[PDB]
């Protein structure tokens, strides 16, 4: 089983630099190439570049040439990437992948890694702010999650009893910080009469929150 | 950098349906055209290499072929576990490039965007902010415009939307404009609109309310 | 284990063609080059061309060009080699050869020597 | 074109002596475009040398290549039966793939003692 263990999300301040780990396993790391490929939330893929741990010999793109820098070391089977000079466009996905190998190079990636999201920022970790929203047959419900860094947090509805009708939406960036809202829809006879409630949790603040919808 | 000119970049399927993905590289090439699948929050996965050759693994019906500048992956009979988003990848010269993609969806029946506006919270309040979220629920298709309006005069700054991906269920999308303001301007306006534009409808879906 | 196994031995009269066959295991048939060489009774080795199993580019021998034409077959991992207008002095051995892999140096053209060779295909013309 | 000429064309020895053979060529070549073959009759050719220096895969240690520019050595430390075979030398650098035209290593014939 091939398998290319990238580090954890890294987080960095603009101008600072990153260095992303990606262990590899199941098969002679010597014996192939590993490329790392940006990716912005969103969109395509971008390649910054080669290296042959068996010789350290690297090709690079053009682009990111003085910014990136790629080794590796054969003993712990790892390849690394070294970031300079983070600026916000930088914040994004970076995937190691092994690449195919025979009389030369042949530069497609059959094995790709686990994926380290790159987060340019100096925002510090700032809990949520969790907001109830409140206003026929169904009636929509739901709760803003403001101002919080890093991500993730998690959101539920009654503990989870509340499963159906229920979607979350992905964070935006305001303020430097991340906002987030959650939709519930319930039969109109559950509520007002029997409570809702959001149960919001931010592990990097180690915050508990649950915000009772109150009819206004 | 070699151009990879791929379409369609959004492709609605049925089950069983034949998907076509074309993929145009800006130049002469031999062969080197390799296809990755990538699910959401999920790896790429190589499928093809050298144009026509399946990776270990891939089922029979993905297919791909093509030469110099016209390369094509088919898929005879797609799967729902083959919704996902596909990229072409030339390994001819560097840099590498890859195309732009194609996502995959259900097709669905067209549905009208359930509109809920809500306003500001007591708690908010209580720290000089004022939040107006807007959600446009279970429509088909994606496409959508949000509009905002305070006292009847279109809002522009200070909106951020955000959108959810198909839904795994009902094979609908969602969206969340949120507008936030200070405490201050909030209270010197009456009425809050949003407006929903969908193909359902000519005239667009309007939720409001008046801050008294 | 890489195995080279190539087509049988052939009989031909002068002015017919023959095409050998050069099945290919135990490795990525497309990522390697691979060559074929000859040797006459009693002779050198002599080279005839190279073709990358990938894309299929060929380089000939100018003693063999347009004679000889190198083709390829992925689906398959196999190389062929067909050789017309075939004349008493083409009588030989025919050898089909993996290039080596690439080990980190210069360019590949530090491993395009003959690393695994097939066992050979004997061509007689005769009449 | 870069021709390669090996010399002896024939090397009569004994088991247990050292062989020395030539690869000359016309024009000067990299080390690392420089290989040896190693043919016994019937068979087919084995990669003995490539890089100039550099052992095949199971090849013994009393192979051992060497040279540069226009002359190549290929020394076999101490003969075995086993070592009695054609030697070519091969050229494949970017020009073109050339052998030389194979060096014949026989068994020395003694007179009685
Ligand atoms: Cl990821
Ligand atoms: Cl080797």
């Known amino acids: 089983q091939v398998q290319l263990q990238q580090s954890g999300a890294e987080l960095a301040r603009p101008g600072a630099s990153v260095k992303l780990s990606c262990k590899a396993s199941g098969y002679t790391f010597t014996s192939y190439g590993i490329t790392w490929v940006k990716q912005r939330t969103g969109q395509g893929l971008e390649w910054i570049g080669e290296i042959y741990p068996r010789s350290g010999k690297n090709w690079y793109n053009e682009r990111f040439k003085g910014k990136a820098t790629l080794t590796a070391d054969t003993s712990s089977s790892t390849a690394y990437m070294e970031f300079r000079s983070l600026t916000s466009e930088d914040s994004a996905v970076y995937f190691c992948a092994r690449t195919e190998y025979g009389s030369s190079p042949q530069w497609y990636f059959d094995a790709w890694g686990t994926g380290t999201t790159v987060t340019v920022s100096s925002a510090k970790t700032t809990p949520p702010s969790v907001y109830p929203l409140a206003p026929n047959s169904m009636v929509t419900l739901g709760c803003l999650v403001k101002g919080y860094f890093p991500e993730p947090v998690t959101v539920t509805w009654n503990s989870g009893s509340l499963s159906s009708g229920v979607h979350t939406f992905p964070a935006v960036l305001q303020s430097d910080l991340y906002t987030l809202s959650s939709s519930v829809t319930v039969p109109s006879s559950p509520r007002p009469s029997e409570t809702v409630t959001c149960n919001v949790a931010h592990p990097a603040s180690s915050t508990k929150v649950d915000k009772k919808i109150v009819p206004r | 950098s070699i151009v990879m000119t791929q379409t369609p970049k959004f492709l609605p399927v049925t089950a069983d349906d034949r998907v076509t993905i074309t993929c145009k590289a800006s130049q002469i090439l031999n062969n080197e055209v390799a296809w990755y699948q990538q699910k959401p929050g999920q790896s790429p996965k190589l499928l093809i290499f050298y144009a026509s050759n399946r990776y270990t693994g891939v089922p029979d019906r993905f297919t791909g072929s093509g030469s110099g500048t016209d390369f094509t992956f088919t898929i005879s009979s797609v799967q729902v576990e083959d919704l996902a988003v596909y990229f072409c990848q030339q390994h001819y010269s560097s840099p590498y490039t890859f195309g732009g993609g194609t996502k995959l969806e259900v097709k669905r029946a067209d549905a009208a965007p359930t509109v809920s506006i809500f306003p500001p919270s007591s708690e908010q309040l209580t720290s000089g902010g004022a939040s107006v979220v807007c959600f446009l629920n279970n429509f088909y298709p994606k496409d959508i415009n949000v509009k905002w309006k305070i006292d009847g005069s279109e809002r522009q700054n200070g909106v951020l939307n955000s959108w959810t991906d198909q839904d795994s269920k009902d094979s609908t999308y969602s969206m969340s404009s949120t507008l936030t303001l200070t405490k201050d301007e909030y209270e010197r306006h009456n009425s809050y609109t949003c407006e929903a534009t969908h193909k359902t409808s000519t005239s667009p879906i309007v939720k409001s309310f008046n801050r008294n | 284990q890489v195995q080279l196994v190539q087509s049988g031995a052939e009989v031909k009269k002068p002015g017919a063609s023959v095409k050998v066959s050069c099945k290919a295991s135990?490795?990525?048939?497309?990522?390697?080059?691979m060559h074929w060489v000859r040797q006459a009774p009693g002779q050198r080795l002599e080279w005839m061309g190279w073709?990358?199993?990938?894309?299929?580019?060929?380089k000939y021998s100018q003693k063999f060009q347009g004679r000889v034409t190198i083709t390829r077959d992925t689906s398959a991992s196999t190389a062929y080699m067909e050789l017309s207008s075939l004349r008493s002095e083409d009588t030989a051995v025919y050898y089909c050869?993996?290039?080596?892999?690439?080990?980190?140096?210069?360019?590949?053209?530090?491993?395009?020597?003959?690393?695994?060779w097939g066992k050979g295909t004997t061509v007689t013309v005769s009449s | 074109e870069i021709v390669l000429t090996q010399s002896p064309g024939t090397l009569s020895l004994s088991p247990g002596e050292r062989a020395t053979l030539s690869c000359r060529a016309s024009?000067?070549?990299?080390?690392?475009?420089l290989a040896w073959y190693q043919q016994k009759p019937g068979q087919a050719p084995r990669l003995l040398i490539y890089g100039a220096s550099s052992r095949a895969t199971g090849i013994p240690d009393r192979f051992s290549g060497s040279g540069s520019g226009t002359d190549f050595t290929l020394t076999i430390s101490r003969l075995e039966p086993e070592d009695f075979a054609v030697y070519y030398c091969?050229?494949?650098?970017?020009?073109?793939?050339?052998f030389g035209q194979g060096t014949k290593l026989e068994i020395k014939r003694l007179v009685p003692r």
């Open positions: 135990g490795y990525t048939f497309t990522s390697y080059a």
């Open positions: 073709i990358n199993a990938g894309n299929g580019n060929t």
């Open positions: 050869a993996r290039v080596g892999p690439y080990c980190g140096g210069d360019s590949p053209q530090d491993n395009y020597y003959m690393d695994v």
């Open positions: 091969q050229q494949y650098g970017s020009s073109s793939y050339t």
């Open positions: 024009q000067s070549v990299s080390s690392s475009y």
